[PDB]
């Protein structure tokens, strides 16, 4: 769902064409800023097949 007005992430804000990463457990999307993941970090995980979980799913 690419809805530009839908609220996402810990911060409850739209995607705003910002870098976002999808949690491999809840499948929701998170701004890299809010979970501490830069584009370089997230692309590297995706390229290497390394799964990532948001902070809530980790706990």
């Amino acid at each position: 769902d690419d809805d530009p007005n839908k609220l996402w992430c810990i911060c409850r804000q739209p995607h705003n064409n910002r870098f976002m990463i999808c949690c491999d457990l809840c499948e929701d999307w998170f701004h890299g800023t809010c979970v501490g993941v830069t584009k370089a970090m997230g692309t590297d995980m995706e390229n290497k097949g390394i799964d990532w979980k948001c902070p809530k799913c980790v706990k």
Binding site: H15, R18, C22, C23, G42, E46, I50, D51
Partner: peptide, 7 residues
């Protein structure tokens, strides 16, 4: 983990 807006 899928990603978007990575340019």
């Amino acid at each position: 983990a899928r990603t978007k807006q990575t340019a």
